[PDB]
């Protein structure tokens, strides 16, 4: 019986956390900051996709180029395999 | 898993409510019930 008896502990959420209070502050820095910095330089993330939208396969490719050199053998291989698969799936398998 | 169904029991019960008074497993087991209930309808 997947459904349960004890209803959960109350999910407390401060909507005025230091994160949420200042979410989006400085974001939009170009159009009112003499274009010193692009908003794409605000974002913090994995280097291979920083201000770059991409696609599944494309992302993989980017990762392989940007980072692959300094990537863990067990994971690099996996990445390569993924790329191989992904190309096949896109360039051949689907509809239209 | 991101999102899996919490409310499934209720769906099951909806059909089983209409199947309560059938004979045998038709009233207990959802799979059998559904076919019977639809037929009845």
């Amino acid at each position: 019986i997947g459904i349960r008896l004890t209803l959960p502990p109350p999910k407390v959420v401060d909507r005025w956390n230091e994160k949420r209070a200042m979410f989006g502050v400085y974001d939009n820095i170009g159009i009112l900051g003499n274009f010193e910095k692009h908003p794409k330089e605000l974002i913090r993330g994995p280097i291979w996709l920083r201000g770059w939208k991409g696609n599944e396969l494309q992302r993989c490719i980017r990762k392989r180029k940007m980072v692959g050199s300094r990537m863990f053998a067990d994971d690099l291989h996996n990445l390569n395999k993924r790329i191989r698969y992904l190309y096949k799936h896109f360039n051949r398998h689907g509809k239209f | 898993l991101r999102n899996r169904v919490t409310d499934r029991y209720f769906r099951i019960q909806e059909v089983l409510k209409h199947a309560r008074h059938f004979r045998g497993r038709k009233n207990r087991c959802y799979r059998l019930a559904v076919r019977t209930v639809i037929r009845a309808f």
Binding site: R4 | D7, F10
Partner: peptide, 26 residues
């Protein structure tokens, strides 16, 4: 342990109803 709340609430309500049906008050 599934992630929701609404479903749980519903279940609780159902249980309550059942209880009421079973042992109703004077």
């Amino acid at each position: 342990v599934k992630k929701g709340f609404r479903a749980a609430f519903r279940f609780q309500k159902e249980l309550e109803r059942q209880r009421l049906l079973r042992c109703p008050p004077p």
